[PDB]
Structure formats: structure tokens, C-alpha cells
Design a protein around this ligand. Structure first.
Ligand SMILES: *[C@@H]1O[C@H](CO)[C@@H](O[C@@H]2O[C@H](CO)[C@@H](O[C@@H]3O[C@H](CO)[C@@H](O)[C@H](O)[C@@H]3O)[C@H](O)[C@H]2NC(C)=O)[C@H](O)[C@H]1NC(C)=O
Ligand SMILES: *[C@@H]1O[C@H](CO)[C@@H](O[C@@H]2O[C@H](CO)[C@@H](O)[C@H](O)[C@H]2NC(C)=O)[C@H](O)[C@H]1NC(C)=O
Ligand SMILES: *[C@@H]1O[C@H](CO)[C@@H](O[C@@H]2O[C@H](CO)[C@@H](O)[C@H](O)[C@H]2NC(C)=O)[C@H](O)[C@H]1NC(C)=O
Ligand SMILES: *[C@@H]1O[C@H](CO)[C@@H](O[C@@H]2O[C@H](CO)[C@@H](O)[C@H](O)[C@H]2NC(C)=O)[C@H](O)[C@H]1NC(C)=O
Ligand SMILES: *[C@@H]1O[C@H](CO)[C@@H](O)[C@H](O)[C@H]1NC(C)=O
Ligand SMILES: *[C@@H]1O[C@H](CO)[C@@H](O)[C@H](O)[C@H]1NC(C)=O
Ligand SMILES: *[C@@H]1O[C@H](CO)[C@@H](O)[C@H](O)[C@H]1NC(C)=O
Ligand SMILES: *[C@@H]1O[C@H](CO)[C@@H](O)[C@H](O)[C@H]1NC(C)=O
Lengths: 596, 184
């Protein structure tokens, strides 16, 4: 009758009640997102409140089982999951104020709008208006207008809230025995109590910085290439030696360079692989796309989808009568009920997305046997890393030929491979300095290294040093540029995207070894090759029951993050870019700006 | 024999309080067992299914209960889990057949059917064919237990059955036929 046995009894009761309440909450959420109506809003909120009240009661009860006497790591991990109070550690007034601030920021971002000069009646929302301007317009002044208007009208409403937010979140984090809120976020990667696999919170910062330095030689060449092409697009606005203007990168924040592809195409006289016409000519629909994804997973040795998946999932747009959120998601409702919510259209992008979301569902299925509190990925970056390797494999020409969408006699050559790799580099590599610099900035803000009076001054210096992007106009301390992004205004961890990207390649290379693949890594197809499927499955079924360093070692042969698989993936692109840049400056000066 | 009153019944008993009906002084016909449902499992341990009509026994008992699909593998000699240990346990030396079928269309409701209870906490393992329908509060801690509380748990939990759950969490109706031989 020791404390460990009482804790195990407690957790068993928790897992049963939690599965029932969680299921009810997840189903109500599903019903709302697939059938949008006020009655479902009330049902979603009532089930959500029931779930939250349950967790608060169980968290309170969980404080009676100290972890110091517990020897079993599974029990200790489940108790850690329940004992943290989070916002419950704050006084009632600060908690209501913090939730007010978070709701205010969400409201300001979601409904923020700007108006055309001298035309108060013609006003654009971030989506689709400004995003469309930033993605498709080639008029320098229009792009700058959208940039500045968003930063002034929205950034200056969020700034004082971000200051109060940072203060309240740091107080909360300190009350939970963390150095700052940055350590709260980095606690997701903490391993403590497994000899040889331990990973401190502070260590995460160092590892990210080391991987970034290794990446730098590749990024600097990609950046320089893009600069030359943009010089032709904007002949009088880009310095051959300086940073790129932030508003010219193809997005609102410069998070991705994917929309610059049409200007930077290596060999523009040849097409990219696009099998949309093949899917239309063959009379494909959403059902065949999902069945082909299923065949992909079955081929590698993973299980078939359940009957409930095919009967309850919403794979097509319900139509004009029944509204739904057309944002692809993979749902695990608990107790064996797995669903995908997508508004599938016949296009190659949705084909790959179907593989991505199926890649998530297979993961949710693999760890379904774990205790309720451990039914998640090893860390925040594993779930998407798995989905991305599934998308990455499905896209290779070998796959398209084998399924029958790419012509049997299509002949790949090096110019097509370079066009493919540049597009991938623009979406995978061009986003890493952004994610690193942004997360690093927040860490320094929460820690207290950057005083409030220099938040933006320091922000722009870092952007120039790490990313190579310079503001087109100066900004004083009344602006809040970081908060103009969804993942900053709302309380989300952004490091997920840097870490996940490296994992994506670490897994893919190891699987390619299991498949006995020869030749360039980017052409690797892990179809069939049941050794790769079993290798991945052995990790996927673990959920959170093991340290992420071990879950990673079980697939790639290493206990930490690395970058070599990524650099190898893009190796022929790096060589090509080095060749293209022999007459160009590689790197950048931080003194030049469009302003001066 | 009246096998249809066991297999074809409006409601099966909860596994914590399984229904043991005794069949005696009768002529059995086991081919009718295949007229009630497609079965998840029909597994005999001490007898051959195809020879059931050639044996004579003094008593046959039909143990009727509802369990989860993932728990069907526990109705067997030598198994462990919340059911093999705390609700219904077969002896290691067992003569009989374990019949299970999917009942999702009859027992599940959208709100959730909470009228099927199982035991998860007990002081000791059950003996073969022992039944315990007590609702006393289980004491997990060292302090005397007075009602529900910090280390005081109700020993029974209900299964929430809903038509959309995966196969492993749908209700299954299980009938175990135990064949007993004595005299006459
Ligand atoms: C993984 O293995 C499967 C087999 O288990 C491979 O699928 C098979 O691919 C071949 C082509 O390489 C198919 O043969 C062709 O079928 C078409 C049907 O119209 C026919 O016109 C061609 O003349 C040829 O016979 C074969 O049918 C197909 N098998 C199945 C069961 O679908 C698959 O290609 C392998 N994966 C990869 C990436 O290659
Ligand atoms: C930690 O506790 C879990 C139970 O919560 C143990 O898992 C059990 O291990 C036994 C080993 O014989 C199995 O038969 C059970 O089926 C397992 N149960 C569950 C729920 O997984 C685990 O082994 C314990 N670990 C340590 C290191 O003591
Ligand atoms: C939030 O979590 C902490 C532990 O992480 C709780 O801390 C204990 O609370 C009890 C009262 O319930 C105190 O007697 C203990 O001294 C606390 N322990 C520590 C380590 O200080 C805390 O109670 C929880 N928050 C609230 C609001 O109760
Ligand atoms: C996965 O499910 C399918 C049904 O969706 C199973 O059945 C096969 O389906 C394909 C569909 O093209 C048929 O061509 C095969 O003939 C079917 N097989 C049989 C034996 O009839 C498939 O077997 C299931 N696979 C796994 C691994 O569970
Ligand atoms: C959508 O929700 C409303 C809520 O009243 C319900 O009546 C309707 O049947 C639901 N429709 C679907 C397709 O789920
Ligand atoms: C492709 O290979 C040919 C071989 O002659 C070479 O001349 C050409 O430059 C290569 N192109 C790329 C993009 O690597
Ligand atoms: C079977 O269960 C019913 C209630 O569901 C009960 O009335 C009946 O007496 C039980 N039969 C046996 C043999 O225990
Ligand atoms: C079971 O009972 C129902 C009525 O409840 C009847 O319609 C059905 O035919 C019966 N089935 C068998 C196999 O006796």
C-alpha cells in the first residue's frame, strides 16, 4: 500500500474517466467543425468545460502523490502531466486578466483589417486580401503598403498587450518553478531520470544554435540566388550586397519563400511535376486519393484503416448548405475512433496532403494502446515530422509512375531535379532562419535580456544578422512586429517548426537505408520495403512512454538532433547554387536598408 | 434446448454480475448456435465443435455477459486483465466453449449506454466461476475509508458504448458454455 501503488490506482481511474470525457469533448468539437451552427457551439463549449473541470479536479488530486518516492518512469511521467497547474497557479484576478489579454490578441489578429489610402470603404482582411497581395503582386509600392499598413494598424494595438502578456506569463512560469516562460516552453524536450538519455531545457538552445551554424553555408547560397532573381524583378530596389526587403519575400512575414518560385525558377522553360491533369483525366475523386494513400501505408507494413474511419470521416466539402472548416486535420477522438477532416479537391496538393494527414492518423493509431496521458508524439515535432516524411515520399516521381499518374515513359533529368529541389528549399530551408530567429527573440524577451525599450531595435538587428532581411521602413517602439504573426499573438510555441524540419530528414534518410535505396536521397521512395515500415512503427507505437532521445535513436541511430540528412537531401542543389553564384557575392551586409 | 433464451435476449447481464443459467434434463442441439449471429469467436477448449452433438453431460451452464472487443481474448483459461482477474475467470482445466459476437447495433447509444458495469479494483483475485456483486468502496490507501474520497474508489466502472467507437471498444455479447459431468 505504498504511495506508488496508490498513484497507479489513481492513474487507472483517471485514464478511464478521462477517456470518456475526452471522447465526448473531441466528438462535440468534430460535430462543430464539420457542421457549423450555434447549437454545436453550445455543445462544444459545454463538453469543453466539463473536460477542463475534470482536469482541474484530477490535477488537484494528483498533488497527493509526490514524485520523489516513485521509481516507475511511466507513472512519474503521467503524474508530471497532471500535476502541473499552469495558469491555476496565478491569483484569480491575474488569471482572468491573462485570459482577457489572450482573447483580445486573438480577436485583434483574427479580425484586424487595413484600409486603402483615401478609400475608407475598401478595406482588406489578412485572409484572403493582404495574403493575396503579398503572394501575387509584383508592384513594389503595393507590397510595401500592405506590409506597413499591417504593422502599423495591428502591431500598434498588440504592443501594450504583448508587454502585459510577457509579464503575466513570466510570473506564471516562475510560479511553476521555471526560470522564465521560455523554459516553460522548452520543458517539452526535457528528459530527466533515464541514464544516458537526459536532456536539459537549456541544452535545447545550444543544440538549435549548433544546427543552425551548420545550415548557414546552404542558406547563404540560397539567399544569394534569390537576391539575383529579385534584382531583375525590382531593378531599382535591391542592393547587390545587402539584405532583401522584408515585404518582397512572398508572404506577410517572410516565413516561407514558396511564393517566390515563379521568379526564381532555375530552368523555367520546363514544367514542374504536376499530376492534377492526370487525376482529372482518370476520373479520380477524394475517395480514390485516400484509398491510394491507404495502399501506400499498407504496402510499407502498416495496418489498414478502420471501418469507422471510412464511415465517419468527412472527406469532401459538404456543400453550400452545411458549412465546415476546410482546414485539413487528423483527429484522434479516443477509444479507437479515428477520423480525418478535409475538404478534398482533385489536385496534387491534396493528394500529398492526404498522405500527410494519413501519416498523422497512422501515428495516432500506433500508440492507441498507451495510457491516455501518453497518447501523443514523443515531442511537439515528431507528429508533423512523420506526416511530412509521408508527403515527401509520396511526391517522388517513382511513386507517381508506380501509382499510374505520371506517364510510364517520363524521363527525369537533372534540370527537373534542380527545379524540384529549389522549390523544396524555398519551403523547407528559407523558413528555418525565420523560425530560429523568432523563437530566439521570444526566448530573450521572456528571459529578460532585451529591455522593453529595445524590443524592436534588437528585433531588426537579429533579422538582418540571421535571416538576411531588412525592414523597408524604420519602426519605433510603438510597433509590435512579432505579434503580427498568428503564432505570436496567440500563445503557441514556434520552435516546433525548426526541430520538426530536422527530424523530417533524419527519419527519411534512415528509412532509405532500410529500403536499400541507392542514388540521391531526394528521389527515395519507401513504398513496399517493409523493413522501413517496421523500423518506423517500433518508434511510432511508443507515444510519450519513452524519452524522445530514445524514440529518435530507435529510428535514426542517434540520441539528438542533426542536420546532415537535410544537407544531403539538398546536396545537388547546394552544388548547383555554388556554381550559379560564382560571379555573385555570397553573404550580406547589415548596414544597407531601403530606407537608407 | 432453450439456447435462444440466452443468445437471443433483450439485455445481457453486466460482466461484474454475469448470468449463469443451468440447462439440464434436456436434449441439446448445438447447430442452432450458428443461427443467432456472425461470431467474433467460437472457440472450444475441451471439446471439438463438430462433435458437440455426440456428447452427453449431466449439466451445461451458460454464462452470459457483455465485455469489450479488446477484452474478448481474456475469456480463456490462463488469461489476465480486469476481467480474467476481477469479473469472470475460467479454471485452467476447462471443458467448454467461449462464444462471442459483436452487439454494437443493440447495446450502443449516441448518448452512451452506462448500464453495463465491470470491476477494476479488488482486494484479491477471483477463484474460478466466483461472482462478486458487492458495491463497497475500495480502499487504496492506508487510512480507514468512509465513503468516496482521496484514496477511496467505487470498485465498479461503467463502459460507455457508442455506435461510432472503433471495433476494440464496441460491446460484445459473450456466452460461455461449461459442460459438467457427474452421474446420470
Ligand atoms: C510496390 O510493389 C507493388 C507490387 O506489390 C508494385 O505494384 C505493381 O507495379 C507494377 C508496375 O511496376 C504493376 O504492373 C503493371 O500493371 C499495369 C496495370 O495496368 C500493366 O498495364 C503493366 O503492364 C504492368 O503489368 C503491377 O500491377 C503492380 N501491382 C499491384 C498489385 O498493384 C508497386 O509498383 C511497388 N512500388 C513501387 C514504388 O514501385
Ligand atoms: C510500470 O507500471 C506499469 C503498469 O502501469 C508496468 O506495466 C505492466 O508490466 C507488466 C510486466 O509483467 C505487464 O504484465 C503489464 O501488462 C503491464 N501493464 C501496463 C498497464 O502496461 C510497467 O512494467 C512498470 N514498469 C516498471 C519499470 O516498474
Ligand atoms: C500548483 O502546483 C503546485 C505543485 O506543482 C502545488 O504546490 C503545493 O500546494 C500545496 C497546497 O495544495 C502546498 O501545501 C505545497 O506546499 C505546494 N508545494 C510546493 C512545491 O510548493 C500548488 O498548490 C498548485 N497550485 C495551487 C493554486 O494550489
Ligand atoms: C485492406 O482493406 C482492403 C479492402 O479495403 C482489403 O481487401 C482487398 O482490397 C483490394 C482493393 O483493391 C482488393 O483488390 C483485394 O482483392 C482485397 N483483398 C481480398 C483478400 O479480398 C485488404 O486485404 C486489406 N489489407 C490489409 C493489409 O488489411
Ligand atoms: C447540424 O447541426 C444541427 C443542430 O441543430 C442539426 O439539427 C443537424 O442535423 C446537423 N446536421 C448534420 C449534417 O450533422
Ligand atoms: C545536367 O547534365 C548535363 C550533362 O552534360 C550538364 O551539362 C548540365 O549542366 C547539367 N545540369 C544541371 C542543372 O545540373
Ligand atoms: C438473467 O438476468 C436477468 C436480468 O437481466 C434476471 O432477471 C435473470 O434472473 C437472470 N438469470 C439468471 C439465470 O441468473
Ligand atoms: C431473435 O429474436 C427476434 C425477436 O426479438 C426474432 O425476430 C429473431 O428471428 C430471433 N432469432 C433467432 C435466431 O432465434
Amino acid at each position: 500500500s505504498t504511495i506508488e501503488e496508490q498513484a497507479k490506482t489513481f492513474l487507472d481511474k483517471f485514464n478511464h474517466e478521462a477517456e470518456d470525457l475526452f471522447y465526448q469533448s473531441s466528438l462535440a468539437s468534430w460535430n462543430y467543425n464539420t457542421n457549423i451552427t450555434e447549437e454545436n457551439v453550445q455543445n462544444m463549449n459545454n463538453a469543453g468545460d466539463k473536460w477542463s473541470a475534470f482536469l482541474k479536479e484530477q490535477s488537484t488530486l494528483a498533488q497527493m502523490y509526490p514524485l520523489q518516492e516513485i521509481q516507475n518512469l511511466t507513472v512519474k511521467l503521467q503524474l508530471q502531466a497532471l500535476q502541473q497547474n499552469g495558469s491555476s497557479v496565478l491569483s484569480e484576478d491575474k488569471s482572468k486578466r491573462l485570459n482577457t489579454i489572450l482573447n483580445t490578441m486573438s480577436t485583434i489578429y483574427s479580425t484586424g483589417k487595413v484600409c486603402n489610402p483615401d478609400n475608407p470603404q475598401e478595406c482588406l482582411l489578412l485572409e484572403p486580401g493582404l495574403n493575396e497581395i503579398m503572394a501575387n503582386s509584383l508592384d513594389y509600392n503595393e507590397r510595401l503598403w500592405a506590409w506597413e499598413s499591417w504593422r502599423s494598424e495591428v502591431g500598434k494595438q498588440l504592443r501594450p498587450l504583448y508587454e502585459e502578456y510577457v509579464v503575466l506569463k513570466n510570473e506564471m512560469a516562475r510560479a511553476n518553478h521555471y526560470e522564465d516562460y521560455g523554459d516553460y516552453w522548452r520543458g517539452d524536450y526535457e528528459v530527466n531520470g533515464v541514464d544516458g538519455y537526459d536532456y536539459s531545457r537549456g541544452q535545447l538552445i545550444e543544440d538549435v544554435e549548433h544546427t543552425f551554424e551548420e545550415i548557414k553555408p546552404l542558406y547563404e547560397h540560397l539567399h544569394a540566388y534569390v537576391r539575383a532573381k529579385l534584382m531583375n524583378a525590382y531593378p531599382s530596389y535591391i542592393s547587390p550586397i545587402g539584405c532583401l526587403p522584408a515585404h518582397l519575400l512572398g508572404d506577410m512575414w517572410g516565413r516561407f519563400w514558396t511564393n517566390l518560385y515563379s521568379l526564381t525558377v532555375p530552368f523555367g522553360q520546363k514544367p514542374n511535376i504536376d499530376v492534377t491533369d492526370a487525376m482529372v483525366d482518370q476520373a479520380w475523386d477524394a475517395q480514390r486519393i485516400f484509398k491510394e494513400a491507404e495502399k501506400f501505408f499498407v504496402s510499407v507494413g502498416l495496418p489498414n484503416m478502420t471501418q469507422g474511419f471510412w464511415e465517419n470521416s468527412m472527406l469532401t466539402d459538404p456543400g453550400n448548405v452545411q458549412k465546415a472548416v476546410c482546414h485539413p486535420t487528423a483527429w484522434d477522438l479516443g477509444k479507437g475512433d479515428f477520423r480525418i477532416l478535409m475538404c478534398t479537391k482533385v489536385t496534387m496538393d491534396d493528394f500529398l496532403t492526404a498522405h500527410h494527414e494519413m501519416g498523422h492518423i497512422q501515428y495516432d493509431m500506433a500508440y492507441a494502446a498507451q495510457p491516455f496521458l501518453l497518447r501523443n508524439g514523443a515531442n511537439e515535432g515528431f507528429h508533423e515530422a512523420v506526416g511530412e516524411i509521408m508527403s515527401l515520399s509520396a511526391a517522388t516521381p517513382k511513386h507517381l509512375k508506380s501509382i499510374g499518374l505520371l506517364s510510364p515513359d517520363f524521363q527525369e533529368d537533372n534540370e527537373t531535379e534542380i527545379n524540384f529541389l529549389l522549390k523544396q528549399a524555398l519551403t523547407i530551408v528559407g523558413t528555418l532562419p525565420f523560425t530560429y530567429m523568432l523563437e530566439k527573440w521570444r526566448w530573450m524577451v521572456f528571459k529578460g535580456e532585451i529591455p522593453k525599450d529595445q524590443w524592436m531595435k534588437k528585433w531588426w538587428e537579429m533579422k538582418r544578422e540571421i535571416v538576411g532581411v531588412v525592414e523597408p521602413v524604420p519602426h519605433d517602439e510603438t510597433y509590435c512586429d512579432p505579434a503580427s504573426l498568428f503564432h505570436v499573438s496567440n500563445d503557441y510555441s514556434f520552435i516546433r517548426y525548426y526541430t520538426r524540419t530536422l527530424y523530417q530528414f533524419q527519419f527519411q534518410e534512415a528509412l532509405c537505408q532500410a529500403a536499400k535505396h541507392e542514388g540521391p536521397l531526394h528521389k527515395c521512395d519507401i513504398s513496399n520495403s517493409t523493413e522501413a515500415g517496421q523500423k518506423l512503427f517500433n518508434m511510432l507505437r511508443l507515444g510519450k512512454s519513452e524519452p524522445w532521445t530514445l524514440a529518435l535513436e530507435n529510428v535514426v541511430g542517434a540520441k539528438n538532433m542533426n542536420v546532415r540528412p537535410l544537407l544531403n537531401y539538398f546536396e545537388p542543389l547546394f552544388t548547383w547554387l555554388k556554381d550559379q553564384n560564382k560571379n555573385s557575392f555570397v553573404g550580406w551586409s547589415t548596414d544597407w536598408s531601403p530606407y537608407a | 434446448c432453450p439456447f435462444h433464451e440466452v443468445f437471443n435476449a433483450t439485455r445481457f447481464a453486466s460482466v461484474y454480475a454475469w448470468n449463469r443459467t443451468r440447462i439440464s434434463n434436456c436434449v441439446a442441439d448445438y447447430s442452432v448456435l450458428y443461427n443467432f449471429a456472425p461470431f467474433f469467436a467460437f472457440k472450444c477448449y475441451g471439446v471439438s465443435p463438430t462433435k458437440l452433438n455426440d456428447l452427453c453431460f449431466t449439466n451445461v451452464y451458460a454464462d452470459s455477459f457483455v465485455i469489450k472487443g479488446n477484452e474478448v481474448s481474456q475469456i480463456a483459461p490462463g488469461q489476465t486483465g480486469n476481467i480474467a482477474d476481477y469479473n469472470y475467470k475460467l479454471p485452467d482445466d476447462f471443458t467448454g466453449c467461449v462464444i462471442a459476437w459483436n452487439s454494437n447495433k443493440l447495446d450502443s447509444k449516441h448518448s452512451g449506454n452506462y448500464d453495463y458495469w465491470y470491476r477494476s479494483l479488488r482486494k484479491s483475485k477471483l477463484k474460478p466461476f466466483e461472482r462478486d456483486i458487492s458495491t463497497e468502496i475500495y480502499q487504496a490507501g492506508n487510512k480507514p475509508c468512509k465513503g468516496k474520497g482521496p484514496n477511496c474508489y467505487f470498485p465498479l466502472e461503467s463502459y460507455g458504448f457508442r455506435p461510432t467507437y472503433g471495433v476494440g471498444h464496441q460491446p460484445y455479447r459473450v456466452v460461455v458454455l461449461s459442460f459438467e459431468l457427474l452421474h446420470a
